[PDB]
Amino acid sequence: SIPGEPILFTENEGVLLCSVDRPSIVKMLSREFDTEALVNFENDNCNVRIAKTFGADFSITEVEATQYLTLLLTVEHAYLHYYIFKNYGVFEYCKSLTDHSLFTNKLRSTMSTKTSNLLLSKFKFTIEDFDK
Amino acid sequence: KCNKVRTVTEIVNSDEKIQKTYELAEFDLKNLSSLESYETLKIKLALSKYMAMLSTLEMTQPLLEIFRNKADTRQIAAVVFSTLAFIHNRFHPLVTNFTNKMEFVVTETNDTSIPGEPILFTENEGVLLCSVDRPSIVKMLSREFDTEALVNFENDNCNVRIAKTFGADFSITEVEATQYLTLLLTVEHAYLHYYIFKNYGVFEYCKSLTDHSLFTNKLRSTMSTKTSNLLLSKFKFTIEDFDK
Amino acid sequence: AQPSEELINMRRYRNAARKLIHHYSLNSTSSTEYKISDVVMTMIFLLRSEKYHSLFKLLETTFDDYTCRPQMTQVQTDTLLDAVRSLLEMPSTTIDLTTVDIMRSSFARCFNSPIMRYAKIVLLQNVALQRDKRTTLEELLIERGEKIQMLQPQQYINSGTEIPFCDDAEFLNRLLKHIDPYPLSRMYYNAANTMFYTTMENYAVSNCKFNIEDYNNIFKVMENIRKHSNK
Amino acid sequence: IMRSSFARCFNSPIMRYAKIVLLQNVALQRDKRTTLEELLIERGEKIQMLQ
Amino acid sequence: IMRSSFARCFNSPIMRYAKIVLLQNVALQRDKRTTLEELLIERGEKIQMLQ
Numbered sequence: 001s002i003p004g005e006p007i008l009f010t011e012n013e014g015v016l017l018c019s020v021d022r023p024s025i026v027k028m029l030s031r032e033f034d035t036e037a038l039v040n041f042e043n044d045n046c047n048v049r050i051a052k053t054f055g056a057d058f059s060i061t062e063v064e065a066t067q068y069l070t071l072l073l074t075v076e077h078a079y080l081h082y083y084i085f086k087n088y089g090v091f092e093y094c095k096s097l098t099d100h101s102l103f104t105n106k107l108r109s110t111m112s113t114k115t116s117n118l119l120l121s122k123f124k125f126t127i128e129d130f131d132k
Numbered sequence: 133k134c135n136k137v138r139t140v141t142e143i144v145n146s147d148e149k150i151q152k153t154y155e156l157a158e159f160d161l162k163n164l165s166s167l168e169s170y171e172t173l174k175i176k177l178a179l180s181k182y183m184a185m186l187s188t189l190e191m192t193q194p195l196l197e198i199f200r201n202k203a204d205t206r207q208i209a210a211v212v213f214s215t216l217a218f219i220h221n222r223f224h225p226l227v228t229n230f231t232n233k234m235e236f237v238v239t240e241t242n243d244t245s246i247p248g249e250p251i252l253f254t255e256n257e258g259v260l261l262c263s264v265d266r267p268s269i270v271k272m273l274s275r276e277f278d279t280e281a282l283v284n285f286e287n288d289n290c291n292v293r294i295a296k297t298f299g300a301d302f303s304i305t306e307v308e309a310t311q312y313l314t315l316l317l318t319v320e321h322a323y324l325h326y327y328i329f330k331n332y333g334v335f336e337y338c339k340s341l342t343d344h345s346l347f348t349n350k351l352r353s354t355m356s357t358k359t360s361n362l363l364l365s366k367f368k369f370t371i372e373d374f375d376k
Numbered sequence: 377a378q379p380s381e382e383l384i385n386m387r388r389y390r391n392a393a394r395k396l397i398h399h400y401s402l403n404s405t406s407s408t409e410y411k412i413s414d415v416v417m418t419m420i421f422l423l424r425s426e427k428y429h430s431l432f433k434l435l436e437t438t439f440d441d442y443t444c445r446p447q448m449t450q451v452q453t454d455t456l457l458d459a460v461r462s463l464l465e466m467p468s469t470t471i472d473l474t475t476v477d478i479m480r481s482s483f484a485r486c487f488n489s490p491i492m493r494y495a496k497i498v499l500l501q502n503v504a505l506q507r508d509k510r511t512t513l514e515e516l517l518i519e520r521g522e523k524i525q526m527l528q529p530q531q532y533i534n535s536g537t538e539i540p541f542c543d544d545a546e547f548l549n550r551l552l553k554h555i556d557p558y559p560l561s562r563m564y565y566n567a568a569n570t571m572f573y574t575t576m577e578n579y580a581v582s583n584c585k586f587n588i589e590d591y592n593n594i595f596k597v598m599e600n601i602r603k604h605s606n607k
Numbered sequence: 608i609m610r611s612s613f614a615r616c617f618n619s620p621i622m623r624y625a626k627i628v629l630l631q632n633v634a635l636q637r638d639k640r641t642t643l644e645e646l647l648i649e650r651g652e653k654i655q656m657l658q
Numbered sequence: 659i660m661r662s663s664f665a666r667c668f669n670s671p672i673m674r675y676a677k678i679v680l681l682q683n684v685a686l687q688r689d690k691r692t693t694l695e696e697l698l699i700e701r702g703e704k705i706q707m708l709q
Contacts (some may be wrong), residue, residue, distance in 0.1 A: 486621070495623070496625070
């Protein structure tokens with residue numbers, strides 16, 4: 001096993017190979033984290049949201065489909081590194097794989113002018129609590 | 133000296149330019165990889181050749197057994213002779229013989245034993261003679277002196293080291309073969325002093341046997357890149373513990 | 377006593393004890409050798425056969441800590457050495473009084489200081505050599521050279537000149553492939569320490585401290601090589 | 608307290624003996640580069656290796 | 659992990675509230691936490707072996 005990244009491209013050991021952590025993937029898909037009955041951030045509704053108040057065989061249910069998004073995101077995150085190294089050297093792994101971080105700087109002018117899968121852009125958690 | 137090599141191009145008539153830049157850090161890396169792999173291969177080849185040559189010599193029984201015996205007078209002398217010839221060739225590939233006078237002596241007694249240099253010489257008491265402590269030599273062959281490999285290293289600039297992680301009848305044991313390297317290096321050391329005295333007088337030879345130190349002077353204009361068996365040069369112990 | 381639990385897995389103790397013995401006595405390949413509790417378990421494992429108790433007593437005398445050397449009760453000492461050989465299960469690899477004395481000297485420092493963090497220190501010297509007279513190398517140089525000159529060759533080993541060689545290239549390649557897997561660097565690192573130990577193993581007698589700077593010169597041989605490459 | 612003390616006591620490395628590293632690094636660039644004349648002087652053998 | 663959860667919780671006698679998210683667990687059966695890089699090395703080594 002490996003920390004974090006559940007997928008690892010060995011770009012060319014003579015030729016490309018990839019790694020798969022089935023045991024983990026199974027952990028993730030052990031799921032049951034999910035139930036839709038929820039509540040969500042909103043504020044200043046009279047100005048901001050109140051207007052939003054006034055507008056509108058395989059016959060499988062949705063929860064599974066929800067689960068698919070997991071592997072969607074995972075493979076995306078892998079694709080990042082894969083693309084990068086396929087376009088550049090190994091050594092930048094010393095940075096990116098220690099911490100992906102500034103790799104966006106390299107990605108500048110690299111993206112094809114179309115976004116991917118960061119709609120709800122406020123993805124964050126408490127930070128100052130770090131008590132380092 | 134990160135040296136982001138910088139480059140530009142233009143069409144004739146200078147319509148408009150393009151720019152790029154690149155980084156040696158992969159290139160030097162790969163070169164070092166290739167170099168060290170290559171030289172390791174070479175050394176392994178050399179050792180193989182030596183082993184084969186030894187194999188030719190019609191031995192009735194395994195090396196360790198030979199040394200554990202002490203009744204012999206031929207085998208051990210012959211082995212020594214062969215090793216010495218091999219080394220002399222490795223310094224003088226066109227040179228093949230020593231013009232006779234080579235003679236050897238078995239020694240058996242602690243009360244004849246000598247520290248450090250286990251093999252000793254008198255270049256001319258009329259003619260050359262040499263002496264060998266078979267008893268002591270035997271002792272190194274205690275296999276428990278040998279065990280499976282540790283894999284330590286130090287001072288790695290991250291991927292500088294990790295990169296390698298992405299870089300792809302005598303049918304007898306590796307460790308048994310490894311035994312040989314002992315006598316290889318021993319005879320090498322001995323040949324050092326032998327060559328010194330062969331070139332110069334006896335008193336400087338005595339000084340060298342007092343300290344294998346002053347060699348660093350005389351062994352110049354002598355090794356014209358004829359590399360020798362010290363690739364992994366980080367030979368060292370703790371030092372501050374010397375405590376005077 | 378209830379060794380069913382107070383000696384549970386007698387192997388558990390025996391194996392580590394044998395490892396430790398092969399380390400401190402003679403030499404062995406490097407390892408992260410330490411457990412004071414394992415030393416304890418060595419003693420406990422010894423406390424169950426007379427062919428142990430004898431040794432155990434001998435070593436326990438070191439708790440008196442003085443470097444006095446006990447009399448050899450010749451007969452029993454010999455039988456004891458035999459028992460040692462047995463209990464070490466080695467193929468009769470010339471187990472000897474001198475190695476026993478070396479282990480005695482090891483215990484001469486083992487218990488003797490409660491340095492409770494890391495005595496990460498070679499203690500090369502042995503007091504218990506045949507004398508502390510500690511004369512220098514040079515006198516022994518003359519003493520040896522005398523008998524060296526007095527000796528006469530056992531065989532008249534040279535006539536003429538020849539060299540052996542062979543060119544079974546296929547055979548060579550076969551050999552090479554068979555050899556190939558071995559991790560060369562580590563699987564020769566051992567020999568260096570082997571010869572190094574051999575040094576003291578020779579000079580176990582009226583020894584002279586200095587070795588270190590000469591070894592360092594042997595190692596800076598490579599520095600000299602690089603300077604040659606730099607003229 | 609006795610327990611917590613012995614916990615430390617049993618973890619006191621002792622009497623460790625000598626060592627060697629050997630493992631080595633050579634140079635980056637200033638160590639003598641190959642030069643094309645040498646490579647040519649080797650490669651010229653293909654002129655007779657032929658086929 | 660669950661076991662250690664309660665031995666984390668009881669540590670607090672503090673009653674107002676605790677945003678604290680003790681994500682780490684002390685007791686994970688080791689002398690001291692290593693780096694990640696070392697693990698990366700050691701794993702990748704064997705990893706390349708696999709067919």
